[PDB]
Design a protein around this ligand. Sequence first.
Ligand code: F6P
Ligand code: F6P
Ligand code: F6P
Ligand code: F6P
Ligand code: ZN
Ligand code: ZN
Ligand code: ZN
Ligand code: ZN
Ligand code: ZN
Ligand code: ZN
Ligand code: ZN
Ligand code: ZN
Ligand code: ZN
Ligand code: ZN
Ligand code: ZN
Ligand code: ZN
Lengths: 326, 326, 326, 326
Amino acid sequence: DVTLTRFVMEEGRKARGTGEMTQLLNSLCTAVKAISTAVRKAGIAHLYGIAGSTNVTGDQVKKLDVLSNDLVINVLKSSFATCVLVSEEDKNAIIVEPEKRGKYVVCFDPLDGSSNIDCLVSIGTIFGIYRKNSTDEPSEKDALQPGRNLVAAGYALYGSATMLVLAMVNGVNCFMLDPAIGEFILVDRDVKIKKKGSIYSINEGYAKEFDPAITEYIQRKKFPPDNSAPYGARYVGSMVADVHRTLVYGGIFMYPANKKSPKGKLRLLYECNPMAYVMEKAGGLATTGKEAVLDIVPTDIHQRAPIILGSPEDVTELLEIYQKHA
Amino acid sequence: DVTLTRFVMEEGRKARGTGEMTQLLNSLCTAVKAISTAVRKAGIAHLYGIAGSTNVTGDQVKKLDVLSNDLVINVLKSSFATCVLVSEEDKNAIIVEPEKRGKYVVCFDPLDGSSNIDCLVSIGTIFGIYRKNSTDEPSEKDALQPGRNLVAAGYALYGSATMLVLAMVNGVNCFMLDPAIGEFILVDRDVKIKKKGSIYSINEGYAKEFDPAITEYIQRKKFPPDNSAPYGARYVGSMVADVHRTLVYGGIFMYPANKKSPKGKLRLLYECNPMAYVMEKAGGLATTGKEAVLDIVPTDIHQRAPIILGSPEDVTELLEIYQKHA
Amino acid sequence: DVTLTRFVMEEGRKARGTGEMTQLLNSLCTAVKAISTAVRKAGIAHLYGIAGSTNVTGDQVKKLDVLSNDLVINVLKSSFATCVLVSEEDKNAIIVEPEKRGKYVVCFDPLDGSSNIDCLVSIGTIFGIYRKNSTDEPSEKDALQPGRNLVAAGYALYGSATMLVLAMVNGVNCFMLDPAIGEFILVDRDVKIKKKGSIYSINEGYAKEFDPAITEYIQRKKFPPDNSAPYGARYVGSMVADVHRTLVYGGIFMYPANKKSPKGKLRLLYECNPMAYVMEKAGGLATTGKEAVLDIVPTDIHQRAPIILGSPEDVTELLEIYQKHA
Amino acid sequence: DVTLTRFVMEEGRKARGTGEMTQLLNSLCTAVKAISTAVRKAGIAHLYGIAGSTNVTGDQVKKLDVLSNDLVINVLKSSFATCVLVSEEDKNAIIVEPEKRGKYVVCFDPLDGSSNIDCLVSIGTIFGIYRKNSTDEPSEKDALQPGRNLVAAGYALYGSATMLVLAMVNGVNCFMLDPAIGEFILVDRDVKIKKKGSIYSINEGYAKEFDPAITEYIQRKKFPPDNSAPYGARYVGSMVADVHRTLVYGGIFMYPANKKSPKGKLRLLYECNPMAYVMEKAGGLATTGKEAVLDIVPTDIHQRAPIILGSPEDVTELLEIYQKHA
Ligand SMILES: O=P(O)(O)OC[C@H]1O[C@](O)(CO)[C@@H](O)[C@@H]1O
Ligand SMILES: O=P(O)(O)OC[C@H]1O[C@](O)(CO)[C@@H](O)[C@@H]1O
Ligand SMILES: O=P(O)(O)OC[C@H]1O[C@](O)(CO)[C@@H](O)[C@@H]1O
Ligand SMILES: O=P(O)(O)OC[C@H]1O[C@](O)(CO)[C@@H](O)[C@@H]1O
Ligand SMILES: [Zn+2]
Ligand SMILES: [Zn+2]
Ligand SMILES: [Zn+2]
Ligand SMILES: [Zn+2]
Ligand SMILES: [Zn+2]
Ligand SMILES: [Zn+2]
Ligand SMILES: [Zn+2]
Ligand SMILES: [Zn+2]
Ligand SMILES: [Zn+2]
Ligand SMILES: [Zn+2]
Ligand SMILES: [Zn+2]
Ligand SMILES: [Zn+2]
């Protein structure tokens, strides 16, 4: 009975605001619905395949990457609530024209889970929202803030159902898209992650490159020293999907640094920070294995960061291993 | 431009038939669309949660399990094309009333991927269709046929998009549900799996219970003896999703027997056989590690069977390991 | 709980048939759903406007006319149940290719209510189905049968909701399109028109050209000689809409001959006959004012015919006036 | 490419506002989408039939009347933009609770075209928005303002497609609901009615009770004194549908006073004023036959008013007749 718009408006009225966050989120929701509709019939629309370009990270851009990126950029611009936009698919930050300029800075991953698009596995959209602090003209530097400065973050999950997970200062709430009326309805309030889970999520195909800590941790999940039941393994392959499951089922999700990648694979501004924020607001933890993800001060809008997140007791157990090896 | 109905009708006209297979599939498609619609808004409809019962396999029945089961049973009965139905959610085979009795026997998994329902990860519906051979009245024995006797098999995948994958004697074809008109449109014709993939899919949380062959194979995927790139790992957790990815991306999917489960976990009649059939029609292989899944003569409608399937070169590599250890 | 497919299949099984009528109707339903979806968002799709051509009747062809015509022609051809097609938008009858040739002849109005398209008023699709009687090759003559030879007829109404009204030998049934699953669900069984209504439907803008009978009848509806309540007037402007209301509310619908049009405006094969058939199966009447519409033997596939239809007592009252003036 | 939200926000930013009008309209749009979805499948949902009550006007309340009323009342309350609500289905004005109280007063007809619901003919929702002028606590008197005080007005038309027609100080714009993404998209900008049309819309079943002016006018439309082509007649029966057609095709719509009804049938606050406002903003006229509808100062929230509206030359022609008879 409660839409995302209604929820955000009331929450914003309690925080004494102008209403552009509601404007920003309402706009973001429109793009998310458009992306969801395209995704649900991508094959019919011939939306699978490459776009013929590579982004800064080196990823081969896909058709849905371009569509989603264009949709998000346009709705945020027209929202009159943003001034600086950072996207995985754009080399440099996008500065909104003076006329439609707002007070928020948005970092987003238009379409997360690239490798899972063609096999119809869950994909999504990730976003992190900051308030412009500076007084000078808007620039890329405005997006180089540590995650702990986020005022809102979340993601749209295009899975069996489309879910918009939104985290703000007071907590995390899940809204499900009702395809019939095109509205996101609140379905899970003040979500909190279990203190300890029973699922570990990591691509073990990188075993040869894992550091001693990750290696020891995985071995521990498979062969509990206390004869407890081994953890079950789950790795969908799309960060949004694995992280969402971690949030609602508990457990741990890992994309750590490895011999070949000092800073892991996932991008700090639009993948790691948003999810770290959602996790901490849900009572979970998010670390690189040596420091809290949200405390990292970025120097590159496309910089990568190792990330280990989920239930506090699980993340802590891994942190102790990193400490032990240090 | 080609619907599943049109495809099946023409293919059936070439095989000189009465048309009940088209009737059966048309009916199945209606249930699949109903399940898809419910799944896409399950949270809004309060469809997440347990049903308050356990099936023969011992699974805790979920709300979507009951809904999907009822929908499939009703449409198949009214199809006038079936005589015996076997469902994961029903203790004994369902014998269709004389009046609406057809010539086909259908084994199905109304909702596959139970553990993934609540976290919105891909789930689906699996089916295997047989032609009644006996001349006597229809009974459970009519469903106890080896998979190689299947005349049609496939699955509906409720992922980022809803796909109906259908395999018949001539090959495998993928049809995507167009939400706007409620029709499955052909999007992938005569699908063939790659001879060798680069993804292995298995729940490694069972490492402590794996046999020496599975153990050696996994280690080989992580540390290629020829210094080739290690395989990537993917395990969505829903058989339909992992198998579909295996079909379109290549690679291998495994749910082998282990120290605790002599016959693995997956069910032969409505999970293993249908997927084994799809795989073989796509040029892939499906084995228990010691024998072809489709050649097993079942004695229990709910019996389990180990299953290793996917690209022929990958499955063969594992088979050689089993042989080596034998 | 009962789909149109299920209804037609069972009704056909009682009539001992091959099943192509079910095939024909299933195919027609697919086109109807496609037309409905396009219509519901025609403005967004830029589907309003002229096509740049005029048909035999002299109507200015519209974009939706072409789209609907193409959809209906293609699905009927691929149905494998038709041999001759007659459309308002095609100069000559369309002979189905030998390979996909069936036993039925279909006369249809792909999009009825042309003048109401742009103002978003109800429009629809009308069809009449005949069984080929001849033994020789299929030709236009096969469509020149009197309406009383119809085996099925009806219409799709794209109004506040999309309804498929189907009339066959046993009666008239209404099925509503469920947008969520793309299936027509039975909502009104064995529909029967009221013996006498209280609504008269006619374009009175033609008053100057009406014959004495129509003139006297209208005056009688406005000034009842028995001081009864005057009839209410309703004229949506789309035959499908006015006729549907006549069916479910009772009353009379008129598009009579006039000084300028000896045979009225509406077309016999794809407008008048189908509606006359629906009406008679519902216990209503359909006359030109001098003879039953269904008994007219056509000589032109695009010939026009005056038509007065609806509740038997109302139509009879008008018939007596025509008789009185004769 | 432009949504109603985007349009209203920009238009409001030009008028220097707080943004609650955008909030109000966004909220209204949500209710309209919910009503549209229910209407499009009303038969399936068993939404046809009476509710078991009668409103102040004496109308037999229908199921869709209650549903639509509840939806509109709830979204407007939660909008935080209204203080007083007037509905056809509510005996007295509804005063919004202090906490969610806004500055606007809204008069609405939750579901217009009652008699057309069951025959699936076009129906809709009509609304008129005023700014609270008083300084004292909100009361029914706040809704008793002349229509010329309206700041916004329009209607949702649930016809072949769902259209939201919005009129504000700068003009009239049409937005069509895209069922796929649940967003109203601008499809007709700055709509202007033709100076003179060729369609007259009135229920001639009331001929016995019409005044001499209406009687002479109709006769003139049928028998032009200058031998011009007679006007065509159209009377859908739902004010929203007939008025919309009048807007986009031109012509005249009439529901005048008659011997039995001194003030006609239509209600001033939620039917006549909104449509009169839309008409005048489109360059049309709206009169009772003796005075402009928008200048009437209401004394009863449910008072009726005669209404004649449409193309200026047509309305003027009728006005001259009223003058001539006066
Ligand atoms: O194939 P890998 O190396 O496990 O990478 C998977 C990761 O790639 C991403 O698609 C980012 O490129 C994430 O969504 C996902 O977590
Ligand atoms: O959690 P586990 O043991 O990996 O089981 C996963 C399997 O369970 C199933 O849901 C069957 O119960 C399959 O769909 C899936 O492959
Ligand atoms: O405008 P007129 O002459 O009343 O014609 C209306 C008729 O035109 C049609 O569109 C056929 O051309 C019918 O659907 C409708 O009954
Ligand atoms: O049946 P009548 O008297 O022509 O009334 C029709 C009018 O009734 C209404 O439904 C209002 O009650 C309007 O929408 C429509 O214009
Ligand atoms: Zn990427
Ligand atoms: Zn990503
Ligand atoms: Zn991305
Ligand atoms: Zn189960
Ligand atoms: Zn299963
Ligand atoms: Zn199951
Ligand atoms: Zn025409
Ligand atoms: Zn027509
Ligand atoms: Zn037509
Ligand atoms: Zn009413
Ligand atoms: Zn009304
Ligand atoms: Zn009303």
